[PDB]
Design an enzyme around this catalytic site. Structure first.
Site, PDB file in Angstrom:
ATOM      1  CG  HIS A 171      -6.490   8.139  -3.809  1.00 23.62           C
ATOM      2  ND1 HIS A 171      -5.690   7.413  -4.680  1.00 23.62           N
ATOM      3  CD2 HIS A 171      -6.664   9.384  -4.367  1.00 23.62           C
ATOM      4  CE1 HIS A 171      -5.396   8.201  -5.730  1.00 23.62           C
ATOM      5  NE2 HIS A 171      -5.935   9.407  -5.534  1.00 23.62           N
ATOM      6  CB  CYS A 172      -4.213   3.244  -1.284  1.00 25.40           C
ATOM      7  SG  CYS A 172      -3.061   1.923  -1.675  1.00 25.40           S
ATOM      8  CG  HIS A 206     -31.350  14.988  -5.437  1.00 26.99           C
ATOM      9  ND1 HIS A 206     -32.225  14.638  -6.423  1.00 26.99           N
ATOM     10  CD2 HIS A 206     -32.102  15.608  -4.490  1.00 26.99           C
ATOM     11  CE1 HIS A 206     -33.443  15.021  -6.097  1.00 26.99           C
ATOM     12  NE2 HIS A 206     -33.396  15.618  -4.935  1.00 26.99           N
ATOM     13  CG  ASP A 265      -2.097  10.756  -4.638  1.00 28.74           C
ATOM     14  OD1 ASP A 265      -2.075  11.942  -4.261  1.00 28.74           O
ATOM     15  OD2 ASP A 265      -2.371  10.393  -5.821  1.00 28.74           O
ATOM     16  CG  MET A 311      -6.343   2.312   1.220  1.00 29.97           C
ATOM     17  SD  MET A 311      -5.200   0.904   1.158  1.00 29.97           S
ATOM     18  CE  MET A 311      -3.900   1.539   2.248  1.00 29.97           C
ATOM     19  CG  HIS A 332     -30.854  17.710  -1.895  1.00 31.84           C
ATOM     20  ND1 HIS A 332     -31.146  18.824  -2.605  1.00 31.84           N
ATOM     21  CD2 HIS A 332     -31.970  17.416  -1.176  1.00 31.84           C
ATOM     22  CE1 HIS A 332     -32.293  19.333  -2.180  1.00 31.84           C
ATOM     23  NE2 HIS A 332     -32.857  18.461  -1.371  1.00 31.84           N
ATOM     24  CG  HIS A 346      -4.978  -0.801  -3.366  1.00 29.55           C
ATOM     25  ND1 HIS A 346      -4.142  -1.008  -2.263  1.00 29.55           N
ATOM     26  CD2 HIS A 346      -4.786  -1.855  -4.215  1.00 29.55           C
ATOM     27  CE1 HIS A 346      -3.449  -2.125  -2.474  1.00 29.55           C
ATOM     28  NE2 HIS A 346      -3.794  -2.644  -3.640  1.00 29.55           N
ATOM     29  CG  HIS A 362      -1.883  -1.136   1.286  1.00 32.46           C
ATOM     30  ND1 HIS A 362      -3.054  -1.235   0.549  1.00 32.46           N
ATOM     31  CD2 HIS A 362      -1.828  -2.258   2.052  1.00 32.46           C
ATOM     32  CE1 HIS A 362      -3.658  -2.386   0.817  1.00 32.46           C
ATOM     33  NE2 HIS A 362      -2.914  -3.035   1.733  1.00 32.46           N
ATOM     34  CD  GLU A 410     -32.402  22.906  -6.689  1.00 33.39           C
ATOM     35  OE1 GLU A 410     -33.375  22.201  -6.518  1.00 33.39           O
ATOM     36  OE2 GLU A 410     -32.226  23.691  -7.684  1.00 33.39           O
ATOM     37  CB  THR A 411     -28.672  19.491  -5.708  1.00 29.78           C
ATOM     38  OG1 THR A 411     -29.947  19.108  -5.141  1.00 29.78           O
ATOM     39  CG2 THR A 411     -27.851  18.287  -6.153  1.00 29.78           C
ATOM     40  CG  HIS A 451      -6.046  14.313  -4.570  1.00 26.41           C
ATOM     41  ND1 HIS A 451      -7.322  14.339  -5.109  1.00 26.41           N
ATOM     42  CD2 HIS A 451      -5.463  13.167  -4.992  1.00 26.41           C
ATOM     43  CE1 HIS A 451      -7.494  13.245  -5.861  1.00 26.41           C
ATOM     44  NE2 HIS A 451      -6.399  12.486  -5.779  1.00 26.41           N
TER      45      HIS A 451
HETATM   46  O1  LIG Z   1      -4.114  11.409  -7.559  1.00 29.65           O
HETATM   47  N1  LIG Z   1      -4.555  10.683  -8.578  1.00 29.65           N
HETATM   48  O2  LIG Z   1      -5.113   9.638  -8.350  1.00 29.65           O
HETATM   49  O1  LIG Z   2     -35.169  16.344  -1.880  1.00 25.45           O
HETATM   50  N1  LIG Z   2     -34.693  15.050  -1.880  1.00 25.45           N
HETATM   51  O2  LIG Z   2     -34.928  14.363  -2.842  1.00 25.45           O
HETATM   52 CU   LIG Z   3      -3.755   0.130  -0.764  1.00 25.64          CU
HETATM   53 CU   LIG Z   4     -35.009  16.169  -3.886  1.00 23.77          CU
HETATM   54 CU   LIG Z   5      -6.053  10.917  -6.908  1.00 23.87          CU
END
Ligand SMILES: O=N[O-]
Ligand SMILES: O=N[O-]
Ligand SMILES: [Cu+2]
Ligand SMILES: [Cu+2]
Ligand SMILES: [Cu+2]
Ligand SMILES: O=N[O-]
Ligand SMILES: [Cu+2]
Ligand SMILES: [Cu+2]
Ligand SMILES: [Cu+2]
Lengths: 337, 336, 336
Positions: free
Chosen positions: B132-133, B303, B95, B147, B252, B142, B92, B276-277, B97
């Protein structure tokens, strides 16, 4: 604030109109907060969604897919009378994404066939917002059966650009986009059913693939083409409101742009400008403002062009006026080498 | 900063807590830059992800899916001790970001079972960020075995809105969303396996369809509901951090809004308001700030409502307080 | 301006170069508006897109997938000569998303094999924009056969950040991302066809699943890896233009960031800052500006990591320079 201050307010009763048109309203609000009253009846009905005769049991606010657009201004109260006729078979309700509390209204509006309810909420946030049915345990099934629409809460001072300049539209159209999941038989032919309940198990199977069979505007393939194309003229300022209650879309006006686009749909967030293709995530509504500068046929599409041209998500605009050769001209028409 | 200047900075050791909670931290930084120290142990373990007893071989930072949220401030140094115990079977790495160079740290942290590594990086950009891995040749396997997690790099002066007004939260919760791809046999029943490597080939076939079999919050259907519902009260300011390391999501809050949303997750980009979303692309984290105004149960969902209610992407908030009838009221309750 | 004014503008002929490189141009415009002339020939031709010998009948502007990037400035006119040689089999045309009217030029440029046409349009809005073929009734089939590219319309004063500071890049690359839909026989082997038309019904059946078989940069798996990696040095400022004409993508520079990202591609909308992964909807182009801080190999991916590492959407940058231990250092290398 108070229950009596509210019964004091003026009341305006609005008659709804079928999409893609929008009922009469004023962009700048005349006077102070109001109680704006609307009525919708729910109808469960068979609709045909393509030229081959494919059928869906739709669940339709006010009998249309999408449900109609409601327009209020910020800090008005919207009061909805929602009626579930006894000819229907299912419980329904309504969740306004514009509203605050009780699952957008859904926890207070569960109506069986033969029941009606009246809900009021304060439109505290300006923007365009989705509404949809959401009954506990069958939320996606009512939504993807067509039971969604949108509302627009305008600022009281009307729309403005990011820098406070007023934006006034000449006309407004509402395009509701719907993903449908229609089960097929062993020959690849769409299935037909007697009642909405009978389609349920087969339809959940298709829904779990996350791949719609049809993605349509205004309830059917080609609904907004031909004699039903939207219209404008050179120089006209048009606002296009677009919603998708379940699945992402990426609208684009072929041969035009979105001059100002509230892609999030919310008018206190400044608009993006000069957009080619904009993105509305599933569960939201967006709005784009454009001034037409050239005459002719335009198409308005979801720019996954398989969803537009294979699955149904294309509409037309027919625009009258004079051609501008400064903006575009054919120097040499198609001709032999 | 020279290596000397780094060596004289104070150090602070942080104890991690399991999502959806976040370790104690202060919003406005106390003093100057620090080296902030964390330790995570990797656990390969079977998890059960739905009520039908479906299993995944999870590869879990600190034993949870998602891994825990780490909080620093801009221009601190994050120093991570990462351990791959000998009880595990796979190599493992990590990374971040948030980090700059060597594939976000992935190229400096490759550890076999029985090994450990210590990585340090400067948190130069404020925001929430996925980690993440990503081991060479097996990156997506992974990640979609759970992960991944997120870190938050707060501005030294805390959060502010578009116009420099301070935004201070009362509560923070971290929701990690995970797409899983569980193989089925002939009769559509999910398969079980006795070691993670045995599931690899069948899993890759499902992954190449791009369609998850489950999409969940906090590692299982119903993880953040009922009993493990997140709580708040009317009037409380709540920051909801949401990550997805592989696939898009569109959060949402049903019955609420995102009052301020950093949908990109990056605090130097001004937030969207009144959402809203909102939309978080696969490979990013986002954050939404909201002040609760009504009591009761809220659902917090992706949503695409098929992903939320059929595949598992739904959580609850339970909110105490008094009902406001000015915001919403039943004028006529359901009736004949 | 007047008719004599338009007719009097200077003309400049530009020779195109293949992606990911870009023709020579100036960031700040030199002098007043011009008519910029480009010529492209369309080629229908079989291309191999993976290391298993999978073939597609591509429909390629100027012989490449993506078509080449054309650069003009705001309020220049772009005048394209488009040629469809008599050895091709299908009618083609071109829709510029940067143009106004006649379906982006598609209604005026329908050329059968053996025909040419010349279109002129005024580039009134600054940004990067997709162009693609779009013949009536067969639009997606030409787009997903590779018949798409992008143009960049720079502001006359060059790029600027949200606060009006100038941004001047040292290098620019164009990454075109393509979703392909290649049919398989009942044994799971990709099918081969004599003529492009023979593949049409089988390809539309795959397209309707909305699931690509391949997602590639520059027309093939690994086209921008290895000896064809993109290059830069520590301290160089790079602009990366990315387009996708049909389907969403979420680019990410693994080990880096997007310091300024016009994720909508339109330079009058202020850029997002400090991005980890940004999001370009299908039917658009975006652009990210980054200053490299650390040397080494970076990967640039669509961060649905299944699409990146199983289906083809991964490129490399090779960056030269000296390591900066303040940003990142291995305190303890992997050890027992
Ligand atoms: O950070 N790229 O998976
Ligand atoms: O507003 N939820 O679907
Ligand atoms: Cu891993
Ligand atoms: Cu909705
Ligand atoms: Cu990434
Ligand atoms: O420009 N519409 O493909
Ligand atoms: Cu319903
Ligand atoms: Cu073509
Ligand atoms: Cu297009």
């Amino acid at each position: 604030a108070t229950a009596a201050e509210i019964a004091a307010l003026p009341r305006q009763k609005v008659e709804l109109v079928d999409p893609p048109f929008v009922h009469a309203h004023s962009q700048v609000a005349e006077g102070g907060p109001k109680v704006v009253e609307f009525t919708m009846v729910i109808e469960e009905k068979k609709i045909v969604i393509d030229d081959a005769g494919t059928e869906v049991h739709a669940m339709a606010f006010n009998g249309t897919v999408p449900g109609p657009l409601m327009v209020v201004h910020q800090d008005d109260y919207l009061e909805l009378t929602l009626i579930n006729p006894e000819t229907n078979t299912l419980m329904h309700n309504i969740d306004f994404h514009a509203a605050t509390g009780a699952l957008g209204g859904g926890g207070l509006t569960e109506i069986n066939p033969g029941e009606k309810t009246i809900l009021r909420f304060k439109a505290t946030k300006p923007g365009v917002f989705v509404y949809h049915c959401a009954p506990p345990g069958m939320v996606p099934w009512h939504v993807v059966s067509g039971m969604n629409g949108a509302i627009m809460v305008l600022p009281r001072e009307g729309l403005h650009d990011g820098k406070g300049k007023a934006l006034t539209y000449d006309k407004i159209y509402y395009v509701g986009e719907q993903d449908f999941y229609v089960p097929r038989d062993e020959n690849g032919k769409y299935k037909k059913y007697e009642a909405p309940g009978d389609a349920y198990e087969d339809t959940v199977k298709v829904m779990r693939t996350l791949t719609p069979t049809h993605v349509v505007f205004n309830g059917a393939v080609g609904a907004l083409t031909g004699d039903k194309a939207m219209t404008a003229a050179v120089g006209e300022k048009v606002l296009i409101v677009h919603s998708q209650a379940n699945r992402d879309t990426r609208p684009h006006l072929i041969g035009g742009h979105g001059d100002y686009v509230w892609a999030t749909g919310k008018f206190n967030t400044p608009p993006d400008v000069d957009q080619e293709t904009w993105f509305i995530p599933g569960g939201a509504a967006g709005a784009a403002f454009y001034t037409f500068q050239q005459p002719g046929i335009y198409a308005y599409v979801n720019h996954n062009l398989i969803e537009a041209f294979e699955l149904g998500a294309a509409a037309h605009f027919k625009v009258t006026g004079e051609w501008n050769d400064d903006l575009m001209t054919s120097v040499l028409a198609p001709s032999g080498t």
